[PDB]
Design a protein around this ligand. Structure first.
Ligand SMILES: O=P(O)(O)O[C@H]1O[C@H](CO)[C@@H](O)[C@H](O)[C@@H]1O
Ligand SMILES: O=P(O)(O)O[C@H]1O[C@H](CO)[C@@H](O)[C@H](O)[C@@H]1O
Ligand SMILES: [Mg+2]
Ligand SMILES: [Mg+2]
Ligand SMILES: [Mg+2]
Ligand SMILES: [Mg+2]
Lengths: 246, 246
């Protein structure tokens, strides 16, 4: 009983884009020997869009872990969600929210819009410009952010304010950063997988160095870790391990 | 060339619910004598959901004005949008946004979530709890709000701060209030309609008294105004005016 578990962006697909039909075809071939799963920081809709038409993703993969595994489809079935408010408690969560509102009230940007704080399943996403900006506005903010280190300074202030309180931050996006509970990196999905009797869980990712969003799940003793540089590399690695004779 | 223009909630449908098939059938009958249109403060998706399946609404009505007419479908065709930032300018808009962020940072509630500021086409929607709350959380906030007058006090502070700057406020919702430019009440749709050569525009609404969201469009010299108390009343009124012989 083996599971191959894959990061999505840069591991199975070009970052944030549709999977190559050849890679998709190989994954289904691999599926004749092992179970296959994906884990990504993006939401289900995004991952679904990258990995097939409609909701095909939950049929094509045995596991679909969205938002680092806080959202789980297991053999086509959506499991219940643990909420961030349940984990953090309402007081810490609101302390965080109000600190962010207060900080952003004092930031002056070329443009602001709406959805400065997006309450997701696995994180709070914080966007100084607001998520409802256009593409050109998005690019404008990104360029300013590089010059003024707006998100970086905001994250420094947050880390210090909440020191010791179990919060983690990532600047994965362009107009935002994510705030998530400690352990709600990709390792989150491993606790559910622990219960599914796999002899071996192979994890493949393209950000397996320190600071990368695959590091923790890669390095976790529950996984056999594989560092890849592209979807073609991932396929080669899988052929080598699971189709040695071929 | 006559247009009948209808508010949606409480005028054609029970508030925020699907239209009665009998009322829907009458509107299509009325359409044999006049053009028919709807104008609502809700977004297109909501109005579409109330008035048919899928996008049937834009086929069933000659005009669909969503968000008070800042979003317009004319004979099945979506017209271009004028944006709030274009109208207000980026400086006033950000002054507004930062005042709201600052104010809300200091509010302590039982629960907070996300989407405190929703940037729509025709307004900014401001929600102290956050739009991404659950139904029970929504009811919890509503009950607290009645006790503490949270939205009312927030709106007082905003009106005073932006006195003379052309902003209007409404507490139409339960967990939020809307901020919109002066004249972006339902009258907004009348400027486009002015260009469409109607001899007469009859407007029907159920909130036509001062303070009601139909008052301005009702009282506008460009419309023949009709006050109704229900969709059955609206139908009766229409039969009386446009099918006098029947
Ligand atoms: O700020 P950006 O560039 O839109 O990226 C953020 O939001 C994306 C969409 O929800 C996420 O997919 C990203 O992971 C990130 O949380
Ligand atoms: O705060 P509430 O109760 O969700 O209502 C507000 O949002 C609704 C949905 O966008 C709108 O339909 C309402 O008109 C209002 O702007
Ligand atoms: Mg990756
Ligand atoms: Mg490992
Ligand atoms: Mg009404
Ligand atoms: Mg009038």
């Amino acid at each position: 009983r083996v599971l191959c578990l894959f990061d999505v962006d840069g591991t199975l697909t070009p970052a944030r884009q549709k999977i190559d039909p050849e890679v998709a075809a190989f994954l289904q071939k691999l599926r004749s020997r092992v179970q296959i799963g994906v884990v990504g920081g993006s939401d289900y809709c995004k991952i679904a869009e990258q990995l097939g038409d409609g909701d095909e993703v939950i049929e094509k993969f045995d596991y679909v872990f969205a938002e680092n595994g806080t959202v789980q489809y297991k053999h086509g079935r959506l499991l219940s969600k643990q909420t961030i408010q349940n984990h953090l408690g309402e007081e810490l969560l609101q302390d965080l929210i109000n600190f962010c509102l207060s900080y952003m009230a004092l930031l002056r940007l070329p443009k602001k819009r709406g959805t400065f704080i997006e309450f997701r399943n696995g994180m709070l996403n914080i966007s100084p410009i607001g998520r409802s900006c256009t593409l050109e506005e998005r690019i404008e903010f990104s360029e300013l952010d590089k010059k003024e280190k707006i998100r970086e300074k905001f994250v420094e202030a947050l880390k210090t304010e909440f020191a010791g309180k179990g919060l983690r931050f990532s600047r994965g996006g362009m107009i935002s950063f994510d705030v998530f509970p400690e352990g709600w990196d990709k390792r989150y999905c491993l606790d559910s997988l622990d219960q599914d009797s796999f002899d071996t869980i192979h994890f493949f990712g393209n950000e397996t160095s320190p600071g990368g969003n695959d590091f923790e799940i890669f390095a976790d003793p529950r996984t056999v870790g594989h560092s890849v540089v592209s979807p073609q590399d991932t396929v080669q690695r899988c052929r080598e391990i699971f189709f040695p004779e071929t």
